[PDB]
Ligand binder design. Structure first.
Ligand SMILES: Cc1ncc(Cn2nnc(CCOP(=O)(O)OP(=O)(O)O)c2C)c(N)n1
Ligand SMILES: Cc1ncc(Cn2nnc(CCOP(=O)(O)OP(=O)(O)O)c2C)c(N)n1
Ligand SMILES: Cc1ncc(Cn2nnc(CCOP(=O)(O)OP(=O)(O)O)c2C)c(N)n1
Ligand SMILES: [Mg+2]
Ligand SMILES: [Mg+2]
Ligand SMILES: [Mg+2]
Lengths: 565, 566, 565
């Protein structure tokens, strides 16, 4: 039979979780005990609650969903930052918080970890701002319905949800869970709408021969990556990805022309998009970053807007049309529109100019790091790319089909990459997992590397030590862009703690030349027992051309005077 | 000199006594930070992450009375909210300022970086309202002066944190100039008739109750009533005990001080004395599940005089608008001697708190030996920051020379608070001997802020208690979740130093596995005036205070009590 | 082509609305103009915004959904009371509010109708507490998605939603609406769950022969009224309705045993429910009123809980199982369980004792009113029954199959009945519409009768004038239960205003004896041009036995001392 806690544990197992992440607190200890009863998933502990949230977020990138368990208030509030992030990045992360004994409500009790007033409804209220569903469970009888509701909602909407459970009901009996299939049950496309949206799209492109396809960062959330390839092959048009959609489309596909990112697009792409008679945008997010400071906004008159659950085409909005069904059906009826792809080729714009192997003993430069990392990419690889110049370095890399890039470009919380890489590596241990993180970002969440050591995960970490916040320097410079340098490589033996209570097998290495980097990378690949951090030394100014160009536009957008009135 | 939204804020902060403000840069606040840097009367101090930034400000407020933290929209503010809730719980006026979207982006259908991906940016304000005494968003320059003044006045009056957000494009725009600083501290005075009636009712109440005990609460400092409490205690000549979270809010060398009142983990004799008292005068107390030892130690309502910072309940009458400082002062002038409870305490011959004697220097280090050596470091110029964990209980057992301070975060109780709080405190009180007692588990949440101690060359002495896990949690309810990955904590110091890298540092990391190693480590720490010293102390998990074990069982029982029926 | 306003108007027409309700205000005047452009529905004006909301609420009871349009703040806030009520009663009412010019946001402007601060986000925030979805529209481009989202949500959840529209965008162009079918698109039951829920139900009742069916007040929201009859006929068990579900099951059906309402149940019903081995509850709401002050709570060990979208049976919870599918599938596989019905019959408990025709010239008594109203019931009739003794009078009435009763027993806002009867009558003009309202309730919303006169609706109103709040008196008595008496009958010629600017055809009559009532009823039926108010005079103490019994239990529940921490 089930308890509130084991009911939750089963539902989490049913949606495919093999792990959940946690930080203990007296308001959740019994809950954690009940979760441990289900042997079909492991309980993974984190350093702090912000990292715990981001670890779950990374896990969701690998496995589709995730769960984080924290304690009331002191745990939940910081975790909310990671949950907001999961919301921004369309990931079904389930945050569960311990909560006060249910006897303490409406009793005039001040409790530890709370604000010092006698009510405990505020945490729930805060959570409602950053989740698709949020439920508080005060009695065992209520648990099943509330658990099922937030989980179904998380899976359907691809957004995080919130649960809190009174600490004294976690072991109390409740109903048992029905079949897992109930949790994935979703509406199908409305047939009449699906067909009308496809027909209207055909009418729209009837006499527009240069059709371009723009791949957006919600393509995965729509589960429409495979259908986009089918559509692209049938169309035979030009396909470009928005920056945050890197790896959401096969880069070896003959129709792929590279990154569309305004004035920092791949060669030829910017012109091709400008020349296109029609742009079919697949689940895009157009924000101030992705439009390069509002300088690159798609022409409304040329745009077919295909969202995950609706299509706007030919001046008509079609709700209840799922992107996957739309792309698949379209691929069956659409005819060849090679116009934009032919135009692209006729530009002879060339490939992205990349640097050649540097002199091994020469001082390390940014391009040389990017080159060697790119040469590590296999169809089995995932690159977690942190906010900072790593965004742009990663964007310039050619991906073998199957290789993945993970970006957090909507939330853009520096430090995300470290615990996300941990969570991801736990969820996809079979992959070659690479983390590209700047020194500034690493300092926010560095400790979670110790958990990589703990669980013996072979994450390869490229710590770019350019002594400060370079992306920030390229937006607007000041003393606040300077940081205290660490001996990052030396941090590894600290987290190992060899000769202490336990042990570890992480490695820390320094790379000041191309040759040192190459040797470091060999050591990293041979290290199967723990993470390897490679501390790369480059100058602050030594960054991509793209960052500098993009940075100026971003700063301009941010600072534009107020308009009148 | 004319003002901008940014320099108006900077001046107000300087006017309330800030010599520093804490920040983490983000594109939504870069220009704001530039404007704050224009005022040379305070420094801009940078933090590793926003949670640490908030707790650094929180620690600074403990040293200087108020503080400010500046973060970026959404990704910065949300984690900082945890520290701001903490400031609320601990009654500290921390001002959180967040950068915000360009004011052209509102009601425009724009998706912005760092936000949820909808086109609305009101949610952060809404969340902030839950954990502050005031929260204001500034979208135009004209609105800035009123909203800045309002949240600052509120923070200072209520002794609670407040929230401001400023559109990133208005930080340099002109606005009115600030008037006199005195306007910011302007508060109502006690209502005279009420003040007198509360004092007279108190005298009537204790007329035929000779055993009067004074219970010092953790809001005594927030009420600014520490000094007046001593005056009242000396006039009364009764027994004075402090609640756990009030440690150091009353002079421990005062002849009336009988020690800690904390239920079954009170100092010897104190529990009985409080039970026997005919009247208990509670000065600004917080009675919660922790401070009542799992609801086992609750003051007798029929014996209680409840003197809160701004009201008094006495003799079955509530008197609002009576400030604790005035009440204590007015009372010290009229009250007569009530030595009953103090005489009773002495007659118990309950003795002093039994403390261990100097251990054999080469013998394996034990918890009591650490506590002994730390206690021997206490001077009238010392402050101990004591982390949630057994360090609560070790610190509680220490005798304080008059003037020595202990800082507790026992209401919020966010493990890891101690590290950035000690940083912020040390920035605000560099003249003091600053000691940090933090467990290994807590240290891992916020460890990086030690790098900022190294950066600003702050001589904080850190006792890292390495008992390999969450011992306080183990003593509440044990499971695999209480185990952590051990670090080489001492070695973390040379990492944050980064000597031979881009800059340098003068922190020191040392290990102590015996009393003798600890003693030598402490010498090195005191001689290190150029950076923090972390002393990694090795003890066993079960090697903790008796008090923690007793208190832990009661807490677990309270937490787990079955539901009652409608 | 469409504007923000005409897009909304079309969506409303697409979901079946033939009317929408409004109160003009400068923030919504242009919006109202755009709604008037769609000739497929009428714009109906109300006296005040509270009545406007309840009119829409009553319309939803007739047509399945409804819409109310009000002005910013001064209009919306009172209307929120009616929207909360629609939420409590599971009705898809769409509230649309005018809002400030979109130039006034983040501008430091104080605006008329607002709080006097410079921000206008508070109304939206308040609305979120009482709706299933709430969206503010500040630009035309955003309108289509936000409109579609709240309407789909209202229809799926059967809950009200909220929209606000900047006053200056109502005429601005936006995309056009796709097919209406997209708005009704909903997930189907999860097959595995549906089958498992049915099989578990069969196992549960395998060796429990006395099976009783308890019909709940969410049966209509689940669209499962018809399927419940099919299941009941197959089962051949005893069927009782909870008070608020009156008319949600055919009372001429051989299996119907009457009202189950604790100690105020129909004769024999209370015992039958106590004796049942299994109780199958179809979409019930168990609250402090419906359990008669927590005195009548179903035995958890006997209960099969069939909610609109889930089933809890045999200690297992099955989400994603729609009540309609569950009942239908169940009716195909279940075998005869006549146990509880046989037991009921064997009680020889008799019919509900009703009074016989009173002496026509004798002073009017409550029972005589109830008798004559009951005799007016036809398969084409709807009785709107107000909170008060009218609840209990209506509950005692035998319904010909097809006759409807409308209750607001969850919200229970006195005065709801008057504007609800207006809205209902507008939506179902073909029915004989009867309103049973007490004098105290009538005073809250009396003016909406003028709108019945205005639109020439033949609503028959029984105004029960017992000079005060009798239901309240029977709960707990005090001076606050006394009201100022009106000449209610005379109110009709006031609303007619004959000899003034316009005219009216309402009638007001008094009934102080059975004979006067009978004659009054004849005049009411012959009056096809306007409402007829029949003012019935009875004593304060002359109420149903049920109200007195139920009232005591309710008072006891309300006043029970606090249990200790
Ligand atoms: C939680 C949070 N706080 C601040 C920011 C603003 N921000 N964005 N990028 C940065 C600096 C980037 O630092 P690094 O990791 O060293 O990147 P690079 O120097 O460009 O290789 C900041 C401070 C942010 N995006 N998220
Ligand atoms: C942010 C936050 N997360 C979790 C908790 C719960 N908690 N309280 N105390 C602990 C364990 C602390 O262990 P240490 O710091 O090593 O101290 P010791 O008791 O001396 O072992 C936890 C995990 C908390 N109080 N705050
Ligand atoms: C808006 C609102 N305000 C107050 C109430 C409380 N209330 N509930 N029933 C009543 C009295 C009912 O008055 P009447 O219509 O005369 O009903 P009867 O006299 O029992 O036929 C009150 C005053 C309520 N249910 N709703
Ligand atoms: Mg850097
Ligand atoms: Mg420890
Ligand atoms: Mg009445």
């Amino acid at each position: 039979s089930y308890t509130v806690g084991t009911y939750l544990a089963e539902r989490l197992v049913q949606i495919g979780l093999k792990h959940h992440f946690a930080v203990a607190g007296d308001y959740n200890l019994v809950l954690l005990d009940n979760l441990l009863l289900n042997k079909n998933m492991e309980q993974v502990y984190c350093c702090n609650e912000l990292n715990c949230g981001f670890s779950a977020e990374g896990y969701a990138r690998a496995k589709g969903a995730a769960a984080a368990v924290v304690t009331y208030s002191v745990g939940a509030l910081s975790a909310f930052d990671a949950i907001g992030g999961a919301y921004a990045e369309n990931l079904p992360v389930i945050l569960i918080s311990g909560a006060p004994n249910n006897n303490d409500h409406a009793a005039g009790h001040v409790l530890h970890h709370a604000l010092g007033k006698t009510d405990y409804h505020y945490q729930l209220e805060m959570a409602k701002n950053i989740t698709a569903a949020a439920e508080a469970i005060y009695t065992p009888e209520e648990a099943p319905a509330k658990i099922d509701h937030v989980i179904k909602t998380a899976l359907r909407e691809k957004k995080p949800v919130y649960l809190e459970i009174a600490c004294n009901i976690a072991s109390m009996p409740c109903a048992a869970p029905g079949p897992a299939s109930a949790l994935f049950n979703d509406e199908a496309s409305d047939e009449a709408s699906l067909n009308a949206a496809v027909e209207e799209t055909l009418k729209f492109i009837a006499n527009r021969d240069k059709v371009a396809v723009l791949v957006g960062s919600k393509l995965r959330a729509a589960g429409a990556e495979e259908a986009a390839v089918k559509f692209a092959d049938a169309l035979g048009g030009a396909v470009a990805t928005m920056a945050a959609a890197k790896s959401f489309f096969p880069e070896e596909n003959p129709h792929y022309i590279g990154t569309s990112w305004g004035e920092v697009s791949y060669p030829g792409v910017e012109k091709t998009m400008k020349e296109a008679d029609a742009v079919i945008a697949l689940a895009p997010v157009f924000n101030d970053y992705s439009t390069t400071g509002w300088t690159d906004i798609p022409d409304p008159k040329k745009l077919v807007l295909a969202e995950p659950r609706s299509v706007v085409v030919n001046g008509i909005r079609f709700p209840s049309v799922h992107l996957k069904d739309y792309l698949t059906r379209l691929a069956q009826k659409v005819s060849k529109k090679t116009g934009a792809l032919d135009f692209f080729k006729s530009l002879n714009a060339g490939e992205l100019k990349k640097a050649a192997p540097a002199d091994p003993s020469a001082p390390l430069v940014n391009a040389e790091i990017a080159r060697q990392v790119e040469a590590l990419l296999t169809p089995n690889t995932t690159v977690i790319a942190e906010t900072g110049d790593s965004w742009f370095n990663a964007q310039r890399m050619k991906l073998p089909n199957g290789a993945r890039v993970e970006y957090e470009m909507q939330w853009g919380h520096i430090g995300w990459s470290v615990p996300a890489a941990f969570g991801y590596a736990v969820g996809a241990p079979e992959r070659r997992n690479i983390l590209m993180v700047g020194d500034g970002s690493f300092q926010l969440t560095a400790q979670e590397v110790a958990q990589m050591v703990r669980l013996k995960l072979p994450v390869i970490i490229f710590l770019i030590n350019n002594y400060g916040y370079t992306i920030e320097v390229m937006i607007h410079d000041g003393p606040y862009n300077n940081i205290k340098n660490w001996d990052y490589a030396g941090l590894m033996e600290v987290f190992n703690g060899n000769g202490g209570y336990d042990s570890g097998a992480g490695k820390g290495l320094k790379a000041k030349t191309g040759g040192e980097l190459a040797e470091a990378i060999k050591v990293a690949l041979a290290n199967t027992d723990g993470p390897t951090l490679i501390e790369c030394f480059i100058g602050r100014e030594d960054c991509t051309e793209e960052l500098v160009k993009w940075g100026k536009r971003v700063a301009a957008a941010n600072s534009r005077k107020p308009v009148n009135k």
